[PDB]
Design a protein around this nucleic acid. Structure first.
Ligand SMILES: Cc1cn([C@H]2C[C@H](O)[C@@H](COP(=O)(O)O)O2)c(=O)[nH]c1=O
Length: 561
DNA sequence: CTTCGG
């Protein structure tokens, strides 16, 4: 009697079947099978639409997804002819919930099911995973459901208020709204910024040997040099033109540069954006394909941990392919659960050898591979130099450095300012002085890169949710991406102001981050899901009830006049 | 009309 192994996608089914013997039949569910209604007397109508009942202790009406009836039948029919069912969904909470939905729709004794967990699809990982199969974790499922229901309530109860008060078709979302707020705030900072004039002066000189030495003026009378207009710069240039220049100090020190940690979801998104020009969506879609194909570890992670076997494999690669000088004494540890960073499943698999992956996916694999190999290599070593020069009442500086050992940079694609030899007390001959006018700059616009970064920093959102927050926002008319930077739209500003005014708690960054903590508490049996939802709902209805009132009574302002 | 996840 064979066993039934169920996964989310045909691609994952294919890969996992490579490592499962004849006693297993693998089948995919082709994505989610059940969720809240697709949605296509007033309270009753609302509950019907939501698919959840906040007033009746969160009773839910899960419905099989449009067009999934046939796979459910295929699955039930296959479930019959099996002696055990292994739920092999992805390792995160959403994956736990999908496994749960499968178990619920298929039915049977819970003892007929096992939940297997792995962070990559390789022979050895599948072996370990099936050698020690666990049970469905209901706390993690409930944490998912809690998130799901909260999101649903906000969306379906706040949005209709927006239709009445501002405009039809608008949306609000527990997360989407807070993300928009960040962009709107940045927009207003930029619009309010008043740039200030400041000047710099550089000096080109020659050493006693005749070599060029470029210096920057740093101090005048022992105070930082920063003239604010042309008059002041010219007065300074006048003095600098006549001064005698000499080297006050030469400071030589060895410096190093360290490789970064291996990627996690947020840093991968950032590096793929800045280095490859890939949008967050593209990146996550390709990462998922690489993972389901068995080439990298799971792509939703916030851990920088590396298994002992993974570290062994990469140190072996470094020793064989770069040499002893590139291998640290002991492995580099980057951590702080059984989770791991985003890394190649097999270090001897090169991006060029990837089967059935487009060029851009190979480029992402390369990005991941290089980061993983580099993170276990030695630091690059430099000989840095700082020269301090005196000229009458002025102080000037020049900094340089020469690479002495490439270390981890050897694995990066194949250039430092070098300073001439001079000794303390040497006279320098002035050749030219170049003043330059500059102005202060407003805060930088959010890039798709910096935004993810900001959400992480504030504890808002998670690896499973940093994804495609940046699509509707744009569809929706709230913010738009232009020339690789975000711009708030007026409707974004209009909605944000209204939400901040009447849904202060919901829009508050710290409260939003706290909710992620609350959900983790549920996942870890430190809180109960319906109680957590009860508290959320009590606070939410307080805001909503008030928001619905006339503005004269403190309700949300209409979008008009 | 709408949520987050796809
Ligand atoms: C979809 C989903 C996944 N995850 C991911 C991150 C972790 O790898 C894992 C959660 O582990 P945990 O349930 O023990 O906290 O699932 C969340 O934390 N929250 C979610 O809502």
């Amino acid at each position: 009697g064979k066993a039934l192994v169920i996964v989310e996608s045909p691609a994952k089914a294919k890969t996992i079947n490579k490592y499962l013997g004849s006693d297993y039949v693998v089948k995919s569910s082709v994505g989610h099978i059940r969720d809240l209604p697709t949605s296509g007397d007033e309270r009753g109508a609302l509950v019907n639409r939501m698919g959840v009942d906040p007033w009746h202790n969160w009773e839910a009406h899960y419905e099989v997804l449009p067009g999934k009836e046939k796979v459910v039948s295929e699955l039930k029919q296959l479930a019959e002819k099996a002696d055990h069912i292994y739920l092999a969904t992805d390792l995160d909470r959403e994956g736990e919930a999908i496994a749960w939905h499968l178990r619920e729709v298929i039915g049977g004794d819970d003892a007929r099911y096992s939940r297997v967990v792995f962070n990559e699809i390789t022979k050895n990982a599948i072996r370990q995973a099936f050698n020690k199969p666990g049970e469905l974790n209901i706390d993690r499922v409930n944490a998912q459901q809690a998130r799901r229901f909260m999101d649903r309530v906000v969306g379906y109860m706040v949005s209709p208020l927006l239709w009445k008060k501002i405009a039809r078709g608008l949306s609000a979302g527990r997360v989407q709204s807070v993300a928009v707020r960040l962009v709107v705030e940045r927009e207003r900072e930029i619009k309010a910024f008043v740039p200030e004039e400041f000047w710099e002066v550089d000096a080109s000189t020659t050493t006693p040997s005749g070599e060029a030495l470029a210096l920057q003026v740093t101090h005048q009378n022992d105070k930082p040099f920063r003239p604010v207009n042309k008059e002041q710069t010219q007065a300074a240039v006048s003095l600098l033109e006549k001064a005698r220049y000499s080297v006050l100090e030469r400071e030589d020190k060895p410096t190093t540069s360290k490789p970064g940690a291996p990627f996690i979801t947020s840093t991968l998104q950032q590096a793929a954006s800045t280095r490859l020009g890939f949008g967050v969506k593209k990146t996550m879609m390709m990462a998922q394909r690489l993972y389901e194909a068995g080439y990298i570890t799971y792509m939703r992670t916030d851990s920088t941990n590396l298994s002992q076997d993974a570290v062994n494999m990469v140190r072996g690669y470094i020793s064989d392919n770069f040499g002893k000088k590139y291998l640290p004494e002991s492995p580099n540890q980057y951590a702080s659960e059984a989770r791991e960073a985003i890394r190649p499943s097999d270090v001897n698999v090169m991006a060029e050898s990837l089967k059935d992956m487009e060029a851009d996916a190979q480029k992402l694999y390369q990005l991941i591979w290089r980061q993983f190999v580099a993170c276990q290599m030695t630091p690059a070593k430099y000989d840095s130099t700082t020269l301090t020069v005196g000229a009458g009442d002025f102080r000037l500086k020049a900094r340089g450095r020469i690479l002495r050992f490439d270390g981890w940079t050897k694995v990066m694609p194949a250039e430092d300012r070098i300073l001439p030899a001079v000794n303390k007390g040497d006279a320098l001959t002035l050749v030219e002085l170049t003043p330059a006018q500059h102005f202060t700059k407003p805060p930088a616009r959010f890039s798709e890169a910096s935004l993810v970064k900001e959400l992480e920093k504030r504890g808002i959102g998670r690896p499973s949710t940093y994804a495609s927050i940046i699509s509707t926002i744009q569809d929706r008319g709230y913010v738009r991406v232009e020339n690789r930077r975000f711009y708030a739209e007026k409707m974004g500003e209009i909605v944000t102001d209204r939400l901040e005014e009447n849904f202060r708690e919901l829009m508050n960054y710290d409260f939003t981050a706290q909710m992620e903590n609350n959900l983790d508490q549920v996942a870890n049996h430190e809180a109960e899901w319906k109680a957590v939802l009860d508290h959320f709902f009590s606070d939410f209805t307080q805001q909503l009830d008030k928001a619905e009132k006339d503005p004269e009574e403190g309700g949300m302002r209409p979008n008009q006049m």
